[PDB]
Design an enzyme around this catalytic site. Sequence first.
Site, short mmCIF file in Angstrom:
data_model
loop_
_atom_site.label_atom_id
_atom_site.label_comp_id
_atom_site.label_asym_id
_atom_site.label_seq_id
_atom_site.Cartn_x
_atom_site.Cartn_y
_atom_site.Cartn_z
CB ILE A 120 -8.75 -21.63 33.62
CG1 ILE A 120 -7.74 -20.70 33.19
CG2 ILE A 120 -10.14 -20.88 34.02
CD1 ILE A 120 -7.87 -20.74 31.64
CB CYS A 121 -10.84 -23.59 38.86
SG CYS A 121 -11.89 -24.72 39.77
CG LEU A 122 -14.22 -22.86 32.30
CD1 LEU A 122 -15.48 -21.91 33.23
CD2 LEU A 122 -13.41 -22.11 31.32
#
Length: 150
Positions: free
Chosen positions: A87-89
């Site tokens: 996840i690109c969070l």
Amino acid sequence: MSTPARKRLMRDFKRLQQDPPAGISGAPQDNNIMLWNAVIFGPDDTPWDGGTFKLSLQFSEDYPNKPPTVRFVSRMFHPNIYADGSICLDILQNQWSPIYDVAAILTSIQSLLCDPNPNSPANSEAARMYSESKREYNRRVRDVVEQSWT
């Protein structure tokens, strides 16, 4: 025995349990306090409604200074989620703070589902679709929702 990460992870476990965020459950394997699994329900009244998404959180001996490696076990289709499930969070890579706990991590991921950041195209096909014709995006979201049930 109790290491500093272990000590933390035990507090994180109890607090997720006593005051759990709606649609979120999580737990470590009775055989490894460092490897967790969690489930997030697609929130109500969103095209994500009804989905039961699986996740794996892997911690290190340097938690909470260093954030857990979170990834989706069930297939996804979202602008900020890569093909491998990572996840690109924000708070999980460049904006992590030791203050954030496991519950806060999951909360943010759930909120991220129905509120993607178009300026962080982890999935470029999903990103375009989200901003061009929401009609094809909702259809595609529905799919990962139906297959998460299996």
